[PDB]
Amino acid sequence: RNGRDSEAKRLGVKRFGGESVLAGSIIVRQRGTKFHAGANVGCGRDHTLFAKADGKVKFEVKGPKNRKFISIEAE
Amino acid sequence: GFEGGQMPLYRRLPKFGFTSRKAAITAEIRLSDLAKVEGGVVDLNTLKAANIIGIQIEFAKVILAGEVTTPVTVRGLRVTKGARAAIEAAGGKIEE
Amino acid sequence: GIREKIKLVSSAGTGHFYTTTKNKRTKPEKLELKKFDPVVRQHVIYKEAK
Amino acid sequence: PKIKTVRGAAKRFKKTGKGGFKHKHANLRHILTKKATKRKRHLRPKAMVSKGDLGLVIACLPYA
RNA sequence: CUUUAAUGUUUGAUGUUCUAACGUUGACCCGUAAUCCGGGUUGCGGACAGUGUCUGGUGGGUAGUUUGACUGGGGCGGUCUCCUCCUAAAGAGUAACGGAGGAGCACGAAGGUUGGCUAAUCCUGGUCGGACAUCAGGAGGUUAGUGCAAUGGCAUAAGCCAGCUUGACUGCGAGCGUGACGGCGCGAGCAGGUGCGAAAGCAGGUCAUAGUGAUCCGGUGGUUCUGAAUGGAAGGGCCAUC
RNA sequence: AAUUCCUUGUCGGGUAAGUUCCGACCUGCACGAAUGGCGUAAUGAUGGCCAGGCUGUCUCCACCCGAGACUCAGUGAAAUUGAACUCGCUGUGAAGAUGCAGUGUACCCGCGGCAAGACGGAAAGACCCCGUGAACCUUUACUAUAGCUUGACACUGAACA
RNA sequence: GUUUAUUAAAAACACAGCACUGUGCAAACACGAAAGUGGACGUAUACGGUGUGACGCCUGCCCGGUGCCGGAAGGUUAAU
RNA sequence: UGUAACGGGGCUAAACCAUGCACCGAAGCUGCGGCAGCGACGCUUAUGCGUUGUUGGGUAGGGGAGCGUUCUGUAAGCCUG
RNA sequence: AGGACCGAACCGACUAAUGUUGAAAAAUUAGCGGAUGACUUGUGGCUGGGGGUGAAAGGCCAAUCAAACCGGGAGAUAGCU
RNA sequence: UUUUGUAUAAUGGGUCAGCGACUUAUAUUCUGUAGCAAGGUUAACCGAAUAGGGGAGCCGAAGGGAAACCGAGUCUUAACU
RNA sequence: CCAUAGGUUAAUGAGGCGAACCGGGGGAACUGAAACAUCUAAGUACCCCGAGGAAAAGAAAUCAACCGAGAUUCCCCCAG
């Protein structure tokens, strides 16, 4: 009655904090907005967060709900 | 091209194109030759006679691929832009 | 499943068609969508819910 | 003997300027209205045969 | 022209009759001192039967073959692709006939944008009216909702309502993710043309993750790209697509 | 019941005692009428059961007569065989030890005899599984085909309605 | 009576007898690319096939399935 | 099958616990001698050494370097009654 | 008279024991069935390999039979030893 | 020898002696080496005949594109940051 | 009836063997496709007929391509 599972989707954080990125680089492939988009970060259609400018990855905690933003410092 | 029984690479990819029939009778002449033609006049024969294109060849073209020196009169062959400038720059003459 | 495939043909003289799917049963009316025609290079009305 | 070309491979790969082989992409023959235009637009240009597969291709195409 | 009448004429159809092709494993004669065969006379049948090529049906009489894998031996049962959670050891991945569930779509609005709004449940009052249909007020806080599983998300709403709409665009794409590969995914930006908005802007489908099928062969539309003397065409290619 | 699983069904007969046998009952898992039903005299190197006689079958073996076996003379094989200076036990160990460990026992060599072991000898296990192995057999598996069968054209025509 | 020569002699095969069915003679049927031959120098009281298996008492119901036989109206249906 | 659950004898410590100092113990490390590989380095230059560091268990397998056999040329030469 | 009865030759082969590197690649010994018939036997002939023949066992077809033997395709093929 | 693992009571071999298994041909690719070098090389054949002729051809010096076509560019696209 | 069939005699030729090569009439399957049926193996093996020192083919109702070539056969390319 069992014996099935899907293929593993390889989510998670692809570039960590302080890690230098190019523009276009995917930072967190994820499933809802567990991590939100910050400065110079875009959120794709499947809530993939990608580097919209070059620089360094900056994980932060902002706002009244303590959300986890991801900025990019210009570098 | 046997991958165990998996469908092989040459058989899971689509096929494209066709063979021209006409590209087998076109040729492609450099500028390093045509100092080799014995005459200073270049037609399809005068190239065939110099063992430089082949007997079956009907069309020829005079690509810039290096260093024409003598004045050469090209007749009835297509010449590229850069090589028209290079034939006409080193004396030369191109009529068609 | 039930949902059929149709060709939205261009109202200009071209043969260019978009293609899509329609529920033929619940929506029997034809489908007109002002789509982009790349041969004319202009947004033309498209017709023909097959 | 003289080596026979795997003939249906010659219809599918074509040699390039530095020895690599180009091929047409799969997945663009039929069932098509279900696919996004972004897929189909990215499957139209021809592509190089990857590193894994050149061994197989060079074995099938010894004169090209 | 329509419709009809007589004649001649041109051909097919059907039934009766006929002798002349063919059959004769009927009789007699001859080769011949021979129940073969051939020839002759005659009888009977006779355009049939029979055989050839073509063709439908029947055809284990005969022939060639096929009749999956996983599997706590094999069979029997179950399973085989894809999505979600756990196992899974706080990056990714990770097995078992381990534990649990789902998909093989839907939608021309349930997509785009602009403007607005905020749930479940319970209590109280109130015509029919009831434990529960509508109304009003309060508590409550998203226990709700999300087209369909589960997980992660969602108030700036991704939820709910309305106006206008077709960006559910076409050509590309820096850069990345992900796979042995085939492949799959994310993508700012550039060009052309568009929608909404006063504008900043947003829009290359849907809150996301399932909703699927390589190649060959072939069908349909477009494009002289090719087109075996030449001009066409057929066929092929390329683009779309089944 | 050549058929009955449950089952050694239940009752009766035979027996001191009868899963078999005979008769009967019928709840026939799953008989049954020419893939014949039920009877059936005679027949059977046929299957099952009972009894008389008879006996070394047996209780339980004993003796004897012969042919080998044993000794001498003559001739003179065979299977097998990595090599052997080839013991017991207890344990270990590719998991059942002549060869390892611990220990115990054992002068060297034959002859008759027995067969417990040498996972003894003979035969690339016949069962089981596997091989995209084979062979024959079957069928409403697939594809063909011989044969049978259908029509068209050919061989193959007239004379009248 | 027959049978597994060489582990099975039997309840199996055979059998007389019964039935069904085909067959009108250039018979059906069989061997045979064919000619021909067997059937048989026979002729339905005969011959071939199939089942059952002396004899006695008997052989019940079912024609929906598969087959066979018969029918020709209509539907569908090849070569041409 | 035979003690047969310390390997055995045997042990009242030759057992266990705590502390300490000895010694035994391997193809480990060191000493002495030798060979080979890979580096580095001053010459030697077509490479060897005053060196110098370090390495050398090995199946499938890869790489490198050799020995022998028979036959052909060198060879009507050179050994050999 | 009789696919009649008893029983030798003759044909067979039911049981037991021996034999099982045999005396024998199927027998010997002691019993056993048929024994005028659908019997048995001699000599010759005919039928042949997907074929024969079969009182049917998948039996027999030269000690070979769910497809003889010989030669060839042929060094079939063997993801196996 | 096969194996995760064999003294294994798993396979093979009584012993000796002789024979007994990665070859050959033709294509293609890479490495070494030799010749010539923007060139290299001939095949069949002629033949004083391993010489010399024979450059038919093949490979390379130019790619892109399905193809026409273009060409140090080309394809895509109406055009490409 | 004429005549043909037939009969008798004479003359000439043939018949059979042989290794390969050659032309023609028939013609597999194992195998490969990692199964198998189209396909392959392969017009191979084999069987049969015939001929010669060679056989066969052969003197364009052939190519080519707006220029031309000039029967057949064999070899090297073309070209995997």
DSSP assigned state of D42: H
B31 neighbors B71 (Cβ within 8 angstroms): no
Closest listed residue to residue C50, CA positions, set C24, C26, C12: C24
Count Cα atoms within 13 angstroms, Cβ side, for B24: 5
Q: Write out chain C residues lying below 8 Å of D33, CB-based.
A: 5, 19-21
Q: Which of A47, A51, A6 is nearest to A30 (CA)?
A: A47
Coil, helix or strand for B96?
coil
What domains does chain C contain, in order, with CATH numbers? Answer: 1-50 (2.20.28.120)
Contact B94, B81 (CB under 8 A): no
Backbone angles phi, psi at D42, to 5 degrees: -85, 0
Long-range contacts from C36-43, C-beta under 8 angstroms, 24+ separation? C37/C10, C37/C12, C39/C10, C39/C12, C39/C14, C40/C10, C40/C12, C40/C14, C42/C12
Lookup result for tokens 């904090």: A17
Distance CA(D34)–CA(D42), nearest Å, equals 15
Q: How many C-beta atoms surround the C-beta of residue C8 within 10 A? A: 21
Q: Are D16 and D40 in contact (CB under 8 A)?
A: no
- Give residue B34's identity as a one-letter amino acid code: L
What is chain A written as a DSSP string? Answer: -----PPP---EESS-TT-EE-TT-EEEE-SSSSSEE-TTEEE-TTS-EEESSSEEEEEEEETTTTEEEEEEE--
Chains that touch A (3 or more CB pairs under 8 A): none
The residue count of chain D comes to: 64
Cβ contacts from B onto D, under 8 A? 44
How far is it, in rounded angstroms, from Cα B79 to Cα B93? Answer: 11
Nearby residues of D52 by Cβ (< 8 Å), 6 or more positions away: none
Contact flag B16-D24 (C-beta cutoff 8 Å): yes
Q: Which domains does chain B have, with CATH numbers?
A: 21-94 (3.100.10.10)
Q: Which helix (H) or strand (E) holds D38?
A: helix D37-43
Of chain D residues 29-58, which have a CB less than 8 A from chain C?
32-33
Q: Please give the Cα distance from A56 to A73 (Å, whole number).
A: 5
Host H or E run for residue D8: helix D7-10
- Residues 2-41 on chain C lying near strand E, CB distance under 7 A: 2-3, 5, 14-15, 17-23, 26-27, 31, 33-36, 38, 41
